[PDB]
Every structure is written in structure tokens, then in C-alpha cells.
């Protein structure tokens, strides 16, 4: 996250870290045994880290659970980036408590102008590599689909929407992918892609979680 601030400790109890060697993507806890992330975060083995704030230091609220099943959306296209969403089933249920809990799936997609919260342990610089120990947060508005398409002509599919700023300096970045965009108490987006991070006129592009509510509920049922 570029141009954000350190989140209050464990104030985003649905935020997870995906770890393979080290932190490489985020995710969102949506049930006791299921996490939503991005399809381009796929690896064959992933350890999910819940209850984290500082990912380099033991704080005592963490739960580390290996993925038992990892399921990419069947229409994910790795060249257009269409349908960039994935589900991870935990090998055991997460313990739900004050510092680890679920985020609601959305009942309607978010209106342009809605203020949302984007979070992750991704790069904090638009140039360079400053990967933070502590979880970062960014308050940012949903853009109109027209402005989103104008910013990235020809590239915005029906699975995508933009959140952020055209003036530059505030955005998600590498190692934020798969993590949450939360608006009005609902998980509305998955961090996906952009041209650079926080560049002028190039806002963040996110997967529209609302479009996958049925796919998520049915996939959970079929694997549970």
C-alpha cells in the first residue's frame, strides 16, 4: 500500500497473509474454513496466516493454517486478467475471536464515490522496495466505470472495477494482491492489478466480488 497509514492492530480481523517462504499475497476470511484471494496468487501449497499485524514478529494472536484446497475461478484468463478470483479452503477451521473473524459477502455492488478501505503488506513505494512489517491501510473511493475504462482503454472487463485516485500517490501495490477492498461492511473487491503503483491517471483495478457471490457459496457447499 502506497500513501496509506498503519492500520490499528487487529482492527481488520478478516485480513490474512498468504505465505510461501515469505508473505506474497493477501486474502480475506469469509467463513470459518474459507478465504477469498486472487487467481494470479495461485500456488500449489500456501500457508494462510490469520490474526497478523506485524508479520515479522510473534505477537500472540496469530493462527497459521495450511491450505487444503485451492480453487481458481474456471474462467480466469491469465492474459486479459478476466475473473481474477480464487478460493482457499483451510485444512482446519480458523478459531473465530476478537482478532480473527469473517467479512460479509456483498448484497449489492458499491456505488461510484463510495469510500472503501484497502489493506495489505504490499510495497509502500511507487519506486523502490519498502515492504512493511506492519499491516497498512488506505481510504479510497470507488471510481465510475466510465473513468475506469478511460484510464485503461480496452482493458477493463465486466469482472473489474477501479478504486483510488487519478492524482497519484495513493494505491495498492505488489504483495497486496488477493487482499480486501471493504465498503459499508462488505467485501467488495479483490486487489488485482494496475500500471505501476500510485502513478498519475492509473488507479488500482479490483475484482468485483459481487459478481461471484453464487460461485463462492456453491463452491463452498461442493467442497464441504
Amino acid at each position: 500500500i502506497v500513501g496509506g497509514y498503519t492500520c490499528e492492530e487487529n482492527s481488520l480481523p478478516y485480513q490474512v497473509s498468504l505465505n510461501s517462504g515469505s508473505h506474497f499475497c493477501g486474502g480475506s476470511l469469509i467463513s470459518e474454513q474459507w478465504v477469498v484471494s486472487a487467481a494470479h496468487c495461485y500456488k500449489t501449497r500456501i500457508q494462510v496466516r490469520l490474526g497478523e499485524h506485524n508479520i515479522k514478529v510473534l505477537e500472540g494472536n496469530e493462527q497459521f493454517i495450511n491450505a487444503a484446497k485451492i480453487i481458481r475461478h474456471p474462467k480466469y484468463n491469465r492474459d486479459t486478467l478476466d475473473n481474477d478470483i480464487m478460493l482457499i479452503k483451510l485444512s482446519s477451521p480458523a478459531v473465530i475471536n476478537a482478532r480473527v473473524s469473517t467479512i460479509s459477502l456483498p448484497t449489492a455492488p458499491p456505488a461510484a464515490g463510495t469510500e472503501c478501505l484497502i489493506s495489505g503488506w504490499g510495497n509502500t513505494l511507487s519506486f523502490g522496495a519498502d515492504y512493511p512489517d506492519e499491516l497498512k491501510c488506505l481510504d479510497a473511493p470507488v471510481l465510475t466505470q466510465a473513468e475506469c475504462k478511460a484510464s485503461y482503454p480496452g482493458k477493463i472487463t465486466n469482472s473489474m472495477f477501479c478504486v483510488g485516485f487519478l492524482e497519484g500517490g495513493k494505491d495498492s501495490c505488489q504483495r497486496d494482491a488477493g487482499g480486501p477492498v471493504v465498503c459499508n461492511g462488505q467485501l467488495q473487491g479483490v486487489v488485482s492489478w494496475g500500471h505501476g503503483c500510485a502513478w498519475k491517471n492509473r488507479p488500482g483495478v479490483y475484482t468485483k466480488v459481487y459478481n461471484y457471490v453464487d460461485w463462492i457459496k456453491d463452491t463452498i457447499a461442493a467442497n464441504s
Partner: protein, 58 residues
């Protein structure tokens, strides 16, 4: 070594952070970089050995 060995490393637009190798022609060796997870260019290898086999150095 192929022409694409001389191209700069390419993180690309996706926002994962996946460790990959590229040939750094200035240093004469394969080095690591952070790959975003999609739209890789050709100077992008999953191991140092793959990079050295194709592009040399070291």
C-alpha cells in the same frame, strides 16, 4: 545467449510478489526480482539454474 536476455526485468501489472530470476547483462549474472504474477516477459525464470542455462553468467 538469446536477445531477450538483454531486456530489463519486468514486474508487470499484477500485484503479487513472486520471487523470480532475470539475467542482468551489466553484472554478467542471474539475479532475483519481484514478479507481479502475470504477463511475464521472457527474461523471467523460476530458478537460477534455468536462467544460467538460457542466458549464461556465473
Amino acid at each position: 545467449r538469446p536477445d531477450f536476455c538483454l531486456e530489463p526485468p519486468y514486474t508487470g501489472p499484477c500485484r503479487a510478489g513472486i520471487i523470480r530470476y532475470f539475467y542482468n547483462a551489466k553484472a554478467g549474472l542471474c539475479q532475483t526480482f519481484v514478479y507481479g504474477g502475470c504477463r511475464a516477459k521472457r527474461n523471467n525464470f523460476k530458478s537460477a539454474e534455468d536462467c544460467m542455462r538460457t542466458c549464461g553468467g556465473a
